[PDB]
Write a protein that holds these residues in place. Structure first.
Motif, PDB file in Angstrom:
ATOM      1  N   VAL A   1       0.825  -1.219   0.000  1.00  0.00           N
ATOM      2  CA  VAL A   1       0.000   0.000   0.000  1.00  0.00           C
ATOM      3  C   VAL A   1       0.855   1.263   0.000  1.00  0.00           C
ATOM      4  O   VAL A   1       1.783   1.384   0.797  1.00  0.00           O
ATOM      5  N   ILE A   2       0.505   2.208  -0.875  1.00  0.00           N
ATOM      6  CA  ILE A   2       1.192   3.501  -0.984  1.00  0.00           C
ATOM      7  C   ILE A   2       0.168   4.624  -0.819  1.00  0.00           C
ATOM      8  O   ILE A   2      -0.856   4.638  -1.501  1.00  0.00           O
ATOM      9  N   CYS A   3       0.463   5.572   0.069  1.00  0.00           N
ATOM     10  CA  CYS A   3      -0.506   6.597   0.474  1.00  0.00           C
ATOM     11  C   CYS A   3      -0.057   8.006   0.056  1.00  0.00           C
ATOM     12  O   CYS A   3       0.662   8.168  -0.930  1.00  0.00           O
ATOM     13  N   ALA A   4      -0.510   9.020   0.793  1.00  0.00           N
ATOM     14  CA  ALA A   4      -0.043  10.386   0.596  1.00  0.00           C
ATOM     15  C   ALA A   4       1.387  10.540   1.138  1.00  0.00           C
ATOM     16  O   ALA A   4       2.341  10.160   0.453  1.00  0.00           O
ATOM     17  N   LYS A   5       1.542  11.073   2.355  1.00  0.00           N
ATOM     18  CA  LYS A   5       2.872  11.266   2.962  1.00  0.00           C
ATOM     19  C   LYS A   5       2.897  11.025   4.472  1.00  0.00           C
ATOM     20  O   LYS A   5       1.950  11.370   5.182  1.00  0.00           O
ATOM     21  N   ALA A   6       4.010  10.451   4.933  1.00  0.00           N
ATOM     22  CA  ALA A   6       4.322  10.229   6.352  1.00  0.00           C
ATOM     23  C   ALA A   6       3.141  10.382   7.311  1.00  0.00           C
ATOM     24  O   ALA A   6       2.464   9.397   7.620  1.00  0.00           O
ATOM     25  N   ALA A   7       2.893  11.609   7.769  1.00  0.00           N
ATOM     26  CA  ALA A   7       1.864  11.879   8.776  1.00  0.00           C
ATOM     27  C   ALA A   7       0.566  11.125   8.494  1.00  0.00           C
ATOM     28  O   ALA A   7       0.009  10.492   9.389  1.00  0.00           O
ATOM     29  N   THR A   8       0.108  11.172   7.245  1.00  0.00           N
ATOM     30  CA  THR A   8      -1.133  10.499   6.851  1.00  0.00           C
ATOM     31  C   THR A   8      -1.055   9.004   7.212  1.00  0.00           C
ATOM     32  O   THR A   8      -2.012   8.448   7.752  1.00  0.00           O
ATOM     33  N   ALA A   9       0.095   8.379   6.943  1.00  0.00           N
ATOM     34  CA  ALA A   9       0.313   6.951   7.232  1.00  0.00           C
ATOM     35  C   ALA A   9       0.699   6.666   8.687  1.00  0.00           C
ATOM     36  O   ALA A   9       0.619   5.521   9.132  1.00  0.00           O
ATOM     37  N   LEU A  10       1.124   7.695   9.420  1.00  0.00           N
ATOM     38  CA  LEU A  10       1.361   7.575  10.869  1.00  0.00           C
ATOM     39  C   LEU A  10       0.040   7.400  11.619  1.00  0.00           C
ATOM     40  O   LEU A  10       0.002   6.867  12.730  1.00  0.00           O
ATOM     41  N   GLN A  11      -1.034   7.880  10.998  1.00  0.00           N
ATOM     42  CA  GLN A  11      -2.376   7.788  11.553  1.00  0.00           C
ATOM     43  C   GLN A  11      -2.882   6.361  11.342  1.00  0.00           C
ATOM     44  O   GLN A  11      -3.358   5.717  12.276  1.00  0.00           O
ATOM     45  N   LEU A  12      -2.757   5.879  10.107  1.00  0.00           N
ATOM     46  CA  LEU A  12      -3.132   4.511   9.742  1.00  0.00           C
ATOM     47  C   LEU A  12      -2.539   3.481  10.686  1.00  0.00           C
ATOM     48  O   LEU A  12      -3.228   2.569  11.133  1.00  0.00           O
ATOM     49  N   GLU A  13      -1.247   3.625  10.969  1.00  0.00           N
ATOM     50  CA  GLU A  13      -0.525   2.687  11.833  1.00  0.00           C
ATOM     51  C   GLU A  13      -1.218   2.609  13.194  1.00  0.00           C
ATOM     52  O   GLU A  13      -1.615   1.532  13.634  1.00  0.00           O
ATOM     53  N   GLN A  14      -1.358   3.762  13.848  1.00  0.00           N
ATOM     54  CA  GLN A  14      -2.149   3.883  15.078  1.00  0.00           C
ATOM     55  C   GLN A  14      -3.471   3.145  14.916  1.00  0.00           C
ATOM     56  O   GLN A  14      -3.838   2.312  15.744  1.00  0.00           O
ATOM     57  N   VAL A  15      -4.160   3.460  13.827  1.00  0.00           N
ATOM     58  CA  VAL A  15      -5.451   2.866  13.514  1.00  0.00           C
ATOM     59  C   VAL A  15      -5.360   1.345  13.361  1.00  0.00           C
ATOM     60  O   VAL A  15      -5.758   0.605  14.258  1.00  0.00           O
ATOM     61  N   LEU A  16      -4.807   0.893  12.237  1.00  0.00           N
ATOM     62  CA  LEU A  16      -4.922  -0.506  11.803  1.00  0.00           C
ATOM     63  C   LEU A  16      -4.236  -1.474  12.749  1.00  0.00           C
ATOM     64  O   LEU A  16      -4.865  -2.396  13.278  1.00  0.00           O
ATOM     65  N   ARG A  17      -2.937  -1.263  12.942  1.00  0.00           N
ATOM     66  CA  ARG A  17      -2.143  -2.078  13.849  1.00  0.00           C
ATOM     67  C   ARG A  17      -3.003  -2.459  15.045  1.00  0.00           C
ATOM     68  O   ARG A  17      -3.129  -3.640  15.366  1.00  0.00           O
ATOM     69  N   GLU A  18      -3.611  -1.454  15.676  1.00  0.00           N
ATOM     70  CA  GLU A  18      -4.453  -1.668  16.855  1.00  0.00           C
ATOM     71  C   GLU A  18      -5.950  -1.709  16.532  1.00  0.00           C
ATOM     72  O   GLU A  18      -6.529  -2.788  16.476  1.00  0.00           O
ATOM     73  N   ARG A  19      -6.565  -0.544  16.315  1.00  0.00           N
ATOM     74  CA  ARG A  19      -8.036  -0.413  16.349  1.00  0.00           C
ATOM     75  C   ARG A  19      -8.788  -1.452  15.488  1.00  0.00           C
ATOM     76  O   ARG A  19      -9.936  -1.786  15.790  1.00  0.00           O
ATOM     77  N   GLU A  20      -8.134  -1.955  14.438  1.00  0.00           N
ATOM     78  CA  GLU A  20      -8.614  -3.129  13.690  1.00  0.00           C
ATOM     79  C   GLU A  20      -7.899  -4.385  14.190  1.00  0.00           C
ATOM     80  O   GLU A  20      -8.552  -5.364  14.558  1.00  0.00           O
ATOM     81  N   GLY A  21      -6.563  -4.349  14.186  1.00  0.00           N
ATOM     82  CA  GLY A  21      -5.731  -5.390  14.818  1.00  0.00           C
ATOM     83  C   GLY A  21      -4.819  -6.217  13.925  1.00  0.00           C
ATOM     84  O   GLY A  21      -4.840  -7.448  13.998  1.00  0.00           O
ATOM     85  N   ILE A  22      -3.998  -5.557  13.108  1.00  0.00           N
ATOM     86  CA  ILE A  22      -3.161  -6.263  12.120  1.00  0.00           C
ATOM     87  C   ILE A  22      -1.676  -6.287  12.486  1.00  0.00           C
ATOM     88  O   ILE A  22      -1.187  -5.433  13.226  1.00  0.00           O
ATOM     89  N   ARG A  23      -0.982  -7.297  11.956  1.00  0.00           N
ATOM     90  CA  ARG A  23       0.475  -7.396  12.018  1.00  0.00           C
ATOM     91  C   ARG A  23       1.090  -6.334  11.092  1.00  0.00           C
ATOM     92  O   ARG A  23       1.660  -6.666  10.048  1.00  0.00           O
TER      93      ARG A  23
END
Lengths: 50, 55, 227, 50, 50
Positions: free
Chosen positions: B27-49
């Protein structure tokens, strides 16, 4: 001399099973032999399994 | 940061993600900060490796 | 020598929990064979619908608590555990419970979905006190059998779960009590006979009817290697 | 050289750096079996080079 | 949901009278259901000439 220290507190839900120590008020204590299913276990003439 | 639960590029993250974990993906997104949010999100709030590749 | 074949006479509904079931006619020395054998399946086994997984906003672990709530998390996990649920079509289902204000929190405060039918609309789940707070939660209900608790579920998986998804042990088995009576049958042909009355008590997640037919199937299913 | 407590091992990572969120320690209520890691502590073994 | 179905493994003939019969696999709390139920028929209801 000691920079930093943290203190995490841990929790566990540790369970009943064989080898444990359960004991009676009058000290008629013993070990758990095995966890029979509720079927094996006998029952009241009014049902109520032991 | 609030758009977490809002737009469907996050709801997609799951329905797509929720069964297609087997293979690996890129997956390729906009820039850094935008994907720093995803990490917080997905890693945890959904629950992925999940891990971070920024700049 | 010819074998009599027993059948169903009448189902006596007393409550959505309790029910007796009368059976005749059975030949001498068979009320003890089946009634026992039936019961052994009826407790051990049997596919009832029960609670497995829960998520809540503003909570991290089960050992913490939420404000404006009398009861604790484990207490609400404990009240969820002993729930009554029904499912029509699919196996695994995701419920949404949203209640706010003063007073108790009964199940009828969950969104009445199509397949979803609740047995006890006045069961106790949780309590609220202060009237400027609420609770939102995604509960997950499943059909299984027996008892696979949370513990055996933390070691047959490796994709890892997220934070907030708590685990209740699953009470898949529905029946809570069962016995069997052995009375003398008066058929209008032979007086030697007996009849089998099976008392039961349950949470209503499976009907008193199917239960019996469903278990004797399982029984026979095992017997299929010797015919 | 003073010891440290952030996520900075040259060995174990990023495998066990999702039990730990970031910046120091185990995030409140993080499910951890035996063996896995909590607070990230790491010590210098001399060698001081220049 | 699927249930295990037990089968016959080996018949050990010892005499024209005596014989053991081994059976696996049966799920927990079923060796008591059938074995008993089988025996109850095997004595009280198998039609031999006497």
């Amino acid at each position: 001399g000691v920079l930093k220290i943290v203190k995490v507190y841990l929790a566990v839900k540790r369970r009943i099973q064989p080898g444990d120590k359960m004991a009676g008020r009058h000290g008629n204590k013993g070990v758990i032999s095995k966890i029979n299913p509720i079927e094996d276990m006998p029952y009241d003439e009014n049902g109520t399994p032991v | 940061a609030t758009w977490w639960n809002f737009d469907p590029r996050v709801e997609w993250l799951m329905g797509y993600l929720t069964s297609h974990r087997s293979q690996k993906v890129l997956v390729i997104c906009a820039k850094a900060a935008t994907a720093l949010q995803l990490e917080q999100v997905l890693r945890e709030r959904e629950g992925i490796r999940a891990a971070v590749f920024h700049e | 020598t010819e074998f009599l074949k027993p059948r169903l006479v009448d189902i006596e509904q007393v409550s959505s929990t309790h029910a007796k079931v009368t059976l005749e006619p059975l030949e001498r020395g068979f009320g003890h064979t089946l009634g026992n054998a039936l019961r052994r399946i009826l407790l051990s086994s049997m596919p009832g619908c029960a609670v497995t997984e829960v998520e809540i906003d503003g909570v991290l672990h089960e050992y913490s608590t939420k404000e404006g709530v009398q009861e604790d998390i484990l207490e609400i996990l404990l009240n969820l555990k002993g729930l009554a649920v029904r499912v029509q079509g699919k196996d695994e289902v995701i419920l949404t419970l949203n209640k706010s204000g003063i007073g108790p929190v009964t199940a009828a405060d969950i969104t009445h979905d199509g397949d979803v039918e609740i047995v006890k609309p006045q069961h106790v789940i949780c309590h609220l006190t202060d009237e400027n707070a609420s609770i939102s939660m995604r509960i997950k209900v499943q059909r299984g059998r027996g008892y696979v608790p949370a513990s055996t579920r933390i070691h047959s998986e490796e994709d890892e779960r997220p934070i907030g998804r708590l685990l209740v042990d699953a009470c898949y088995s529905p029946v809570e009590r069962i016995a069997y009576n052995v009375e003398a049958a008066r058929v209008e042909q032979r007086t030697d006979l007996d009849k089998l009355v099976i008392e039961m008590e349950t949470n209503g997640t499976i009907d008193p009817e199917e239960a019996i037919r469903r278990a004797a199937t399982i029984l026979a299913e095992q017997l299929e290697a010797f015919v | 050289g003073p010891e440290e407590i952030t996520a900075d091992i040259p060995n174990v990572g990023e495998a066990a750096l999702s039990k730990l969120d970031e910046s120091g320690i185990v995030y409140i209520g993080a499910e951890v079996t035996g063996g896995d890691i909590l607070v990230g502590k790491v010590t210098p073994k001399g060698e001081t080079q220049l």
